[PDB]
Short mmCIF file of C-alpha atoms and ligand atoms in Angstrom, two decimals:
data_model
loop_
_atom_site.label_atom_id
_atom_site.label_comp_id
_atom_site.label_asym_id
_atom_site.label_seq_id
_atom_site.Cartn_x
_atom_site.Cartn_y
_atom_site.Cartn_z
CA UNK A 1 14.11 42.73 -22.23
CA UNK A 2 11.04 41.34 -24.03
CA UNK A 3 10.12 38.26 -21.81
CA UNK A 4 6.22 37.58 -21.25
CA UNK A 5 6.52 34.45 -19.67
CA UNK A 6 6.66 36.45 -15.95
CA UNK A 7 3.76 38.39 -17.20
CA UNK A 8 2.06 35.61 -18.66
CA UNK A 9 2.30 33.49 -14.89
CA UNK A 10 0.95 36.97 -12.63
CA UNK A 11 -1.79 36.71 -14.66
CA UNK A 12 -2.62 33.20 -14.42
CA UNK A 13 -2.08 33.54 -10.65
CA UNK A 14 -4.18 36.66 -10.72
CA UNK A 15 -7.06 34.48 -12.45
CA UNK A 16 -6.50 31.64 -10.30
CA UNK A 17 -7.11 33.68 -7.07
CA UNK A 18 -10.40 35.57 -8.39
CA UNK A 19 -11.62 32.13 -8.29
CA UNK A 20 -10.76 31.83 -4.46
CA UNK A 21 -7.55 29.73 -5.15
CA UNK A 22 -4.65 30.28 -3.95
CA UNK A 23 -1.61 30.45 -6.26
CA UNK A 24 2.35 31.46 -6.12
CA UNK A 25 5.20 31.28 -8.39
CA UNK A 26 7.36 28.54 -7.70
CA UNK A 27 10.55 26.16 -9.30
CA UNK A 28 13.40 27.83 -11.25
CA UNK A 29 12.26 31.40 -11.47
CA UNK A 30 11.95 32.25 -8.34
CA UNK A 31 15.81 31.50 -8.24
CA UNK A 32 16.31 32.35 -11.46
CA UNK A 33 14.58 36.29 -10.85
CA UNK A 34 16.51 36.32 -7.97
CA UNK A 35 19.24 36.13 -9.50
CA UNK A 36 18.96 38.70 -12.17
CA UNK A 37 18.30 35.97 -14.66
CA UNK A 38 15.31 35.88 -17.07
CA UNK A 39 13.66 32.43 -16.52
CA UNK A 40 13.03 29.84 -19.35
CA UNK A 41 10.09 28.57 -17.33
CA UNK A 42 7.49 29.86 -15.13
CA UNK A 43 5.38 27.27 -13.60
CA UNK A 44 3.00 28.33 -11.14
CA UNK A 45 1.63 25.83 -7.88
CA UNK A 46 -1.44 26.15 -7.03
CA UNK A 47 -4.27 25.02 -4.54
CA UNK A 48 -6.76 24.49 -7.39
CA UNK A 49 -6.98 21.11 -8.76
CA UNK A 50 -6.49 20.15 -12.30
CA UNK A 51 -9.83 20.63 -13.69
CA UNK A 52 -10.56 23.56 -11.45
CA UNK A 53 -7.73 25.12 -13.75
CA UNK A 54 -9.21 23.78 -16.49
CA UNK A 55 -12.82 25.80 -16.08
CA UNK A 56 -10.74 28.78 -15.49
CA UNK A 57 -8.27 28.75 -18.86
CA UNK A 58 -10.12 28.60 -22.43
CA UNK A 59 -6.73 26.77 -23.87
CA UNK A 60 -5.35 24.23 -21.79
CA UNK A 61 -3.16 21.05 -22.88
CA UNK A 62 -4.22 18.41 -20.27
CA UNK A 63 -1.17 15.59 -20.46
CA UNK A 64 -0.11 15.82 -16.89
CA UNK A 65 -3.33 15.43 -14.79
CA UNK A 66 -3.01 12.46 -13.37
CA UNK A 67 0.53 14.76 -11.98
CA UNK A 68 -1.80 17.34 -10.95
CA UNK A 69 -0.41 19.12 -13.71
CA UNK A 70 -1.99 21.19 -16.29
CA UNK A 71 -0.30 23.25 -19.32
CA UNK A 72 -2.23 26.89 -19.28
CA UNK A 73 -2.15 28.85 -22.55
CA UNK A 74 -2.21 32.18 -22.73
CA UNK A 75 -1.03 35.40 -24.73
CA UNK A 76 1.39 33.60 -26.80
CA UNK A 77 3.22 31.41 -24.04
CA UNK A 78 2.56 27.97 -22.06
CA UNK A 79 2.28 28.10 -17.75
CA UNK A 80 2.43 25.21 -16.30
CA UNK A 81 0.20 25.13 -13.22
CA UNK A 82 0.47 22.31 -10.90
CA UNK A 83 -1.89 21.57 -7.73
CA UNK A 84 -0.13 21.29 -4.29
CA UNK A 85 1.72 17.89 -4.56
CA UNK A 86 4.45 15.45 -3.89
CA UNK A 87 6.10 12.57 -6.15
CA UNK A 88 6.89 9.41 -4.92
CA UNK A 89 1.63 11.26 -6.37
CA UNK A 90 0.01 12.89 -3.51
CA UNK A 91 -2.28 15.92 -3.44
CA UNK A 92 -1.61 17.83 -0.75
CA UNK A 93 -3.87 20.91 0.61
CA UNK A 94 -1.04 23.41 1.34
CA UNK A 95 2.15 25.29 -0.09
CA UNK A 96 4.75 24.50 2.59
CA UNK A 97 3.65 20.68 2.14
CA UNK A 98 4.69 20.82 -1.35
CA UNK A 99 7.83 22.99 -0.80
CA UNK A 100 8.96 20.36 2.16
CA UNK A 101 9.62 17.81 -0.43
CA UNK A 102 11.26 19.42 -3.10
CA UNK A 103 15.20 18.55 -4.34
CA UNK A 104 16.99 21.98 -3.27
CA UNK A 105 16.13 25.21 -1.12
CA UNK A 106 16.92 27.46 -3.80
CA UNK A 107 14.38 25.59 -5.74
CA UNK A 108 11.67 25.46 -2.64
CA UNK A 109 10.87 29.14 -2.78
CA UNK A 110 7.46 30.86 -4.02
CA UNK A 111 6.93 34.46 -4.80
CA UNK A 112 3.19 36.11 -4.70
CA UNK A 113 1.36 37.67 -7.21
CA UNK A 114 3.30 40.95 -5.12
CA UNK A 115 6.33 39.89 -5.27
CA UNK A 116 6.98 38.47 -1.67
CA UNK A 117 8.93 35.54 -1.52
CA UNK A 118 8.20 32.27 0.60
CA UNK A 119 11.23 31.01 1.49
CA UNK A 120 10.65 28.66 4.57
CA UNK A 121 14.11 26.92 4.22
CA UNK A 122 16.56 29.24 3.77
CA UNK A 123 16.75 29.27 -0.06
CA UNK A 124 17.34 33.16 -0.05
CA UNK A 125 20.65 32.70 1.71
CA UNK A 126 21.77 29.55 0.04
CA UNK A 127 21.00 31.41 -3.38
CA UNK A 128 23.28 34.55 -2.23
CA UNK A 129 26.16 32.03 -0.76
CA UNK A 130 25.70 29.84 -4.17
CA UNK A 131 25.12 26.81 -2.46
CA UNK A 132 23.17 23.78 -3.62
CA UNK A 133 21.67 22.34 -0.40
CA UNK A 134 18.96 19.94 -0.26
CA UNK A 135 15.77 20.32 1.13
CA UNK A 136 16.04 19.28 5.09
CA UNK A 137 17.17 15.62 5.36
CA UNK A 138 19.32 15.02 2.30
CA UNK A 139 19.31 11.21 2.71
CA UNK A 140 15.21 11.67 1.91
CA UNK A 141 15.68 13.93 -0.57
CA UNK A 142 17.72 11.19 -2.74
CA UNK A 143 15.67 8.52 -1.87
CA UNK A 144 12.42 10.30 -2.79
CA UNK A 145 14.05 10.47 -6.18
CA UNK A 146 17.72 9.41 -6.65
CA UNK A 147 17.88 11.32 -9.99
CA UNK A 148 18.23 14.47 -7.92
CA UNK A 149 21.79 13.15 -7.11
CA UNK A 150 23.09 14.22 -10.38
CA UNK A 151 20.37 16.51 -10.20
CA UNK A 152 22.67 18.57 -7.92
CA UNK A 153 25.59 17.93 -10.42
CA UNK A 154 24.34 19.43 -13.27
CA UNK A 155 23.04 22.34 -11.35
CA UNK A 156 26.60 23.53 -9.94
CA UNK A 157 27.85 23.97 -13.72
CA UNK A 158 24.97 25.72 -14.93
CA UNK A 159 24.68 28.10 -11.87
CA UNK A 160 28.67 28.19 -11.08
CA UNK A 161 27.42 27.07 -7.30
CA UNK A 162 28.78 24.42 -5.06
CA UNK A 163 26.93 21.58 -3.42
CA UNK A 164 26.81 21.64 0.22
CA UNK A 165 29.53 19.95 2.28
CA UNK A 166 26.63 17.67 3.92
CA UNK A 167 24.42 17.02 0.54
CA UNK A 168 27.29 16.25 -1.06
CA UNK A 169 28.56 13.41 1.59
CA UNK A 170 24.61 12.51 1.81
CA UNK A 171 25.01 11.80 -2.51
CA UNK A 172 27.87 10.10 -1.51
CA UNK A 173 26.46 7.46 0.79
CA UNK A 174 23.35 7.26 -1.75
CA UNK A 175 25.43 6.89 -5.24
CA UNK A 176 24.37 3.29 -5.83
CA UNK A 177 20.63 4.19 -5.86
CA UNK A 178 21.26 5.93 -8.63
CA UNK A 179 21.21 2.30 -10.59
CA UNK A 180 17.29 2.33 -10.02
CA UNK A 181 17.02 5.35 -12.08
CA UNK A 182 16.12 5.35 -16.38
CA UNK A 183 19.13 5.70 -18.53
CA UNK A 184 16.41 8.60 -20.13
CA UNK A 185 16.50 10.30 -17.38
CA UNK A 186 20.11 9.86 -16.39
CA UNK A 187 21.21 10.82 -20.34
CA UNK A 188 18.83 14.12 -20.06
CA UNK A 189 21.20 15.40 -16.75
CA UNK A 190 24.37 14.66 -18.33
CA UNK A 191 23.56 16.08 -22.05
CA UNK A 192 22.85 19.25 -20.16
CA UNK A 193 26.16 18.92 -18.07
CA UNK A 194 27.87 18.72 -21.81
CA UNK A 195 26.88 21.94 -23.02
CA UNK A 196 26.94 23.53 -19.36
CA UNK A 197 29.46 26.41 -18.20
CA UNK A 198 32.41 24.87 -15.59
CA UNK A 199 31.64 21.58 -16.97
CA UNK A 200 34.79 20.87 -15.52
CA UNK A 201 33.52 21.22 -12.13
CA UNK A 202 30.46 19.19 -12.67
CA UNK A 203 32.57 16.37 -13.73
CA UNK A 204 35.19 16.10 -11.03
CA UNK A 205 32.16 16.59 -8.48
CA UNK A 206 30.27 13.70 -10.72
CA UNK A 207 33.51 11.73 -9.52
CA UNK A 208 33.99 12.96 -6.02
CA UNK A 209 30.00 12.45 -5.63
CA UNK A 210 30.85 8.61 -6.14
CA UNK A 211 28.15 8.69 -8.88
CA UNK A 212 30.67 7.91 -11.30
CA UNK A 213 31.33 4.65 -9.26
CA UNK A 214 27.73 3.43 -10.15
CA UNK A 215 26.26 5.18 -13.42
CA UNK A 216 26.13 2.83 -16.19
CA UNK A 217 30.08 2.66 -17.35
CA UNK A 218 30.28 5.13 -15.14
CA UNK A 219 33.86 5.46 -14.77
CA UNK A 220 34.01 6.45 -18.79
CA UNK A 221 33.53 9.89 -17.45
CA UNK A 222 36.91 9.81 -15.15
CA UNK A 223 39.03 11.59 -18.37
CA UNK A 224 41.14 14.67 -18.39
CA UNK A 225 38.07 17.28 -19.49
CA UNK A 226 40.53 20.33 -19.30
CA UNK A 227 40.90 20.51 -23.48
CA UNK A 228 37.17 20.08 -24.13
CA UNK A 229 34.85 22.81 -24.99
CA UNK A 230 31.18 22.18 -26.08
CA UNK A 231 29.87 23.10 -29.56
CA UNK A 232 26.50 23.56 -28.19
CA UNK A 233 25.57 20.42 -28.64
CA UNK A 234 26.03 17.53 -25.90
CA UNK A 235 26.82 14.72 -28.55
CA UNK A 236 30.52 16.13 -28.53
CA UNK A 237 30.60 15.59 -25.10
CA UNK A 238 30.59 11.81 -25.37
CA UNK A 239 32.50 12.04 -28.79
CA UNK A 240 35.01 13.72 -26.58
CA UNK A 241 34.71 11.27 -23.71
CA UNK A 242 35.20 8.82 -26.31
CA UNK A 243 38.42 9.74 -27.86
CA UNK A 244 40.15 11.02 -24.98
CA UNK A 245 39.73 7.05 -23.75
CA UNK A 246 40.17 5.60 -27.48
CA UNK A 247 37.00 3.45 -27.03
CA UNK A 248 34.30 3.06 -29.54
CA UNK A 249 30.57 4.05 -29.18
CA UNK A 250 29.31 0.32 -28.12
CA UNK A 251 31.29 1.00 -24.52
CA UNK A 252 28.34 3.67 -24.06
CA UNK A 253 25.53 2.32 -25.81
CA UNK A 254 23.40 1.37 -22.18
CA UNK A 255 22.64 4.93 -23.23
CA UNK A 256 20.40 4.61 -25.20
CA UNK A 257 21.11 6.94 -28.19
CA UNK A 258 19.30 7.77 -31.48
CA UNK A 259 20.20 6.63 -34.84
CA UNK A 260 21.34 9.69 -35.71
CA UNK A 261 23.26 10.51 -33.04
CA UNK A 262 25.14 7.51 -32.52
CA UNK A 263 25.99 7.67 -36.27
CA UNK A 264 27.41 10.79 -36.04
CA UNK A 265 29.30 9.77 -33.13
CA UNK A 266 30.45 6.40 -34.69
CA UNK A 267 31.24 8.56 -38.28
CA UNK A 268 33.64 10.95 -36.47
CA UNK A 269 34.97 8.63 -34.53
CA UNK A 270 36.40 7.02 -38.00
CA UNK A 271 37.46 10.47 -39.05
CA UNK A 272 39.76 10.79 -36.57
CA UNK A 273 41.32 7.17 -37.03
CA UNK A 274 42.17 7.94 -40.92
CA UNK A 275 45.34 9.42 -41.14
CA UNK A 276 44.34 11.91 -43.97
CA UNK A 277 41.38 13.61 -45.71
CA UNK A 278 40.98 14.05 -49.15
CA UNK A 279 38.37 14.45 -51.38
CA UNK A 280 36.21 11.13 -51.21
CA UNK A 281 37.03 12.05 -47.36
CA UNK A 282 34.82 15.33 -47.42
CA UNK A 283 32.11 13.93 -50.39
CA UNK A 284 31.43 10.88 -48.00
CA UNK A 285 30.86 12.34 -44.53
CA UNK A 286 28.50 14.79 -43.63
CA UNK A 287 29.77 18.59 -42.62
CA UNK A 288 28.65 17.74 -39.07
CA UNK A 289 30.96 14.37 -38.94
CA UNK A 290 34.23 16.51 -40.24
CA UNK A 291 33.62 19.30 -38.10
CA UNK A 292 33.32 17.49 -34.79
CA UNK A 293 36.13 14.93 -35.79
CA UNK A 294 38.19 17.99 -36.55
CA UNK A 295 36.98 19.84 -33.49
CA UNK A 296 37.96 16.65 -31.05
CA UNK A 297 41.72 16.36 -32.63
CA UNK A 298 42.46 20.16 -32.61
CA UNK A 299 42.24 20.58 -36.65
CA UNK A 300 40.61 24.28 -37.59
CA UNK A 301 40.48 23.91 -41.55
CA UNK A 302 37.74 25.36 -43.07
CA UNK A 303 35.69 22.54 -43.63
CA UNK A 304 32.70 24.03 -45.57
CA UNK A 305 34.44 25.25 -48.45
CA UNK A 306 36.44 22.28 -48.87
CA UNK A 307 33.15 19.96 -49.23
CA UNK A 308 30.76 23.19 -50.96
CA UNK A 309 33.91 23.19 -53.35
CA UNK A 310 33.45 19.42 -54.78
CA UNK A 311 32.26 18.51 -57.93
CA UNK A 312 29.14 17.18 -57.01
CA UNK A 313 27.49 16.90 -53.55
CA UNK A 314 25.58 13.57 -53.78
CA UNK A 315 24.74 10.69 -55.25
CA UNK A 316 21.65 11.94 -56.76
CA UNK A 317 23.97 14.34 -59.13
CA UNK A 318 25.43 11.14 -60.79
CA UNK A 319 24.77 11.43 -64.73
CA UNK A 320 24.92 7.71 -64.53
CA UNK A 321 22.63 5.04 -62.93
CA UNK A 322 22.32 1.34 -62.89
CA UNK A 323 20.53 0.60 -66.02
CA UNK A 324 22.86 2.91 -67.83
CA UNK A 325 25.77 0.03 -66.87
CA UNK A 326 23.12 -2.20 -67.21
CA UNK A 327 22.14 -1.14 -70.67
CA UNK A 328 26.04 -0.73 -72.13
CA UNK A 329 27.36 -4.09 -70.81
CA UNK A 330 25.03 -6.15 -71.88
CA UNK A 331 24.61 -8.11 -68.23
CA UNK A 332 21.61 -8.76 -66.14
CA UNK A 333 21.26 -6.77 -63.23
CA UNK A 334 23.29 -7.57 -60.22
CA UNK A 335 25.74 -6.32 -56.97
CA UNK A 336 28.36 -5.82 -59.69
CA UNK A 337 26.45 -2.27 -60.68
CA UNK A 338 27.33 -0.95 -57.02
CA UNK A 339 30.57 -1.85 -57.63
CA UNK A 340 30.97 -0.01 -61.00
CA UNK A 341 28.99 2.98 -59.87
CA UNK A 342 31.34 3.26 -57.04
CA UNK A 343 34.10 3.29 -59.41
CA UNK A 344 32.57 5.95 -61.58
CA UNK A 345 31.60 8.14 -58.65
CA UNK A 346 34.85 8.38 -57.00
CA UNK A 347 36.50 9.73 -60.62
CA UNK A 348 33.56 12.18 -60.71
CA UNK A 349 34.45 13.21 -57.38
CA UNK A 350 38.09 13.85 -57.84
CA UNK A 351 37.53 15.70 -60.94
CA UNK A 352 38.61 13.39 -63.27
CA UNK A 353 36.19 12.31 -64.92
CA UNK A 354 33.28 14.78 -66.32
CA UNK A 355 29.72 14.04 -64.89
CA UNK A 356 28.52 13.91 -68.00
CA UNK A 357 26.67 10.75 -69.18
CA UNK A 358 28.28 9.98 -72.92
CA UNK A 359 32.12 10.72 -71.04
CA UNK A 360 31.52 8.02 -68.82
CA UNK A 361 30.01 5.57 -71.60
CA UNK A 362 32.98 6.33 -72.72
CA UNK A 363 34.90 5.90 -69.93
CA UNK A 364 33.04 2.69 -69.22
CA UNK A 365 32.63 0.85 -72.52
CA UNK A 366 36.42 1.00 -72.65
CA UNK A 367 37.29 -0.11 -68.54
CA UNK A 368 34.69 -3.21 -68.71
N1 2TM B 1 13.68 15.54 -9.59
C1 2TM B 1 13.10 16.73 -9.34
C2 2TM B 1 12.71 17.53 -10.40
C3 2TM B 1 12.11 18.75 -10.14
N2 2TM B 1 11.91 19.16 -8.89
C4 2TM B 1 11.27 20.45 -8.61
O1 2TM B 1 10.52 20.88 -9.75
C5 2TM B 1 10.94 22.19 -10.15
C6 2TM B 1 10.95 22.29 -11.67
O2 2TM B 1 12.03 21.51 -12.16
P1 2TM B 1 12.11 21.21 -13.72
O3 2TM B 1 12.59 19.79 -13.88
O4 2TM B 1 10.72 21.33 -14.29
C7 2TM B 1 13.21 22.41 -14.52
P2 2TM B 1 14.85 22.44 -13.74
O5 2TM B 1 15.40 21.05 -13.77
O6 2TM B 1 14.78 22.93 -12.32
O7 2TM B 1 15.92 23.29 -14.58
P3 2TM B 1 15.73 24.83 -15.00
O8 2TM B 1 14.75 25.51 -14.08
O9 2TM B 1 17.07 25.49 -14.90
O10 2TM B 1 15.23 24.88 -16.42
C8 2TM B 1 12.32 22.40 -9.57
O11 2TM B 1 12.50 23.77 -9.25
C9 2TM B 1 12.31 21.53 -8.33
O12 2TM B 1 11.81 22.31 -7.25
C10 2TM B 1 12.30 18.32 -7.83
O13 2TM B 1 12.11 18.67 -6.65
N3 2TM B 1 12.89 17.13 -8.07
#
């Protein structure tokens, strides 16, 4: 491989200790290196407090003090290094008091600077019988922070694990404080869930959790999710979700989407209502909008070269603008121009009529 985030994090712990702190690993690599996966994040924890770290590091991006939390920046890559805490914050002065509180064992462990692992609840074993378990008392767990609910969810797609008999029937008795939690936050878990491996898993546990019972419209997520498989990207999850239910994007608006992103899911959704595609079809929509509509109702044309193939791309190609109409009819501006540029544009756009400025004069001087 050609990681350096590993690298990068010994030594940051290797600077933080010179100082007299003490510093370990923690999070998501320390399950992810032990299972033979290269982590996309090393943060480190740390007994050093925020600007302790900062004396220490010449680059430093300083957005999560008041967390305890500060972003060290070194030899190309970004460690986040974090003072012994909990969230509710509260500094704490030792590693186990930190590790006590955290969502899931397998996610409570620390590894030195020599590569011994703290593991004082069992996340070693829970790793190697792929078991999401939380942290002691599950009921505090979810109450600490009732995001880690679906938390837990998300985690046994993306590690192919399953959550443990009694977190799971602790989730279970919890669900409803999962209506406390942002729709942000909630939207963040199950965008990763859409583009996850065994999403199929996630989801029926997302139902047998009871979480589906109290997320907002939760029970949009109760569909058959055996024909779906992401694109990559999560929108095509609720596209999917969506059309398998024949509902319309205002049903899961409480999420909170983007412009963009509801537009392409409100776009494709029309796709797959017209009965067929032709030209105007693939000149109007974007490549994105066709491809998902075609991806969610089974088509598998190739969709680039029928849109690449057009006569013109855009609007901007038009040889013709509003003072041209303006200019030959003799009228005042008005909404009528929209109208006849509309008109024109569509005969450009089947081939009909030439994009050529003096053709549609023409064309025009004799239709008006
Ligand atoms: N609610 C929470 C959120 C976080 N944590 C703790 O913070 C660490 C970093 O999570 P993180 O959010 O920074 C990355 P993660 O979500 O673990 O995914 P990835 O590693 O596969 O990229 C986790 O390992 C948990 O121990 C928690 O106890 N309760």
């Amino acid at each position: 491989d050609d990681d350096d985030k590993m690298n990068t994090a010994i030594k940051v712990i290797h600077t933080l200790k010179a100082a007299g702190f003490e510093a370990y690993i923690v999070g998501g690599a320390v399950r992810d290196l032990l299972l033979g996966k290269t982590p996309h994040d090393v943060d480190v924890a740390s007994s050093a407090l925020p600007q302790q770290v900062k004396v220490l590091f010449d680059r430093t991006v300083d957005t999560g003090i008041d967390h305890g939390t500060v972003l060290v920046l070194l030899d190309g890559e970004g460690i986040e290094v974090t003072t012994f805490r909990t969230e509710s914050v509260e500094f704490v002065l030792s590693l186990e008091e930190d590790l006590r509180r955290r969502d899931f064992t397998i996610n409570a462990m620390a590894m030195t600077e020599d590569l011994k692992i703290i593991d004082p609840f069992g996340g070693k074993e829970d790793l190697k019988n792929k078991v999401i378990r939380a942290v002691g008392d599950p009921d505090e767990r979810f109450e600490e922070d009732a995001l880690r609910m679906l938390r837990a969810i998300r985690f046994s797609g993306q590690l192919d694990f399953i959550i443990d008999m009694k977190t799971l029937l602790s989730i279970r008795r919890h669900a409803r404080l999962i209506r406390f939690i942002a729709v942000e936050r909630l939207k963040s878990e199950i965008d990763k869930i859409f583009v996850n491996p065994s999403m199929q898993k996630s989801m029926a546990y997302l139902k047998d959790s009871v979480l589906t019972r109290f997320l907002p419209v939760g029970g949009l997520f109760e569909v058959d999710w055996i024909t779906y498989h992401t694109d990559g990207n999560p929108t095509y999850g609720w596209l999917y979700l969506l059309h398998q239910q024949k509902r319309q994007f205002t049903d899961i608006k409480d999420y909170r989407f983007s412009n963009e992103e509801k537009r392409l899911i409100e776009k494709s959704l029309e796709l797959t209502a017209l009965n067929t595609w032709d030209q105007w079809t693939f000149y109007k929509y974007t490549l994105k909008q066709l491809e998902m509509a075609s991806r969610v109702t089974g088509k598998k044309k190739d969709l680039a070269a029928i849109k690449r193939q057009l006569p013109i791309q855009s609007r901007s190609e038009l040889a013709v603008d509003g003072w041209d109409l303006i200019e030959w009819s003799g009228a005042k501006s008005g909404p009528w121009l929209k109208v006849w540029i509309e008109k024109i544009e569509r005969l450009i756009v089947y081939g009909i009529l030439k994009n050529d400025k003096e053709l549609i004069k023409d064309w025009f001087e004799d239709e008006y």
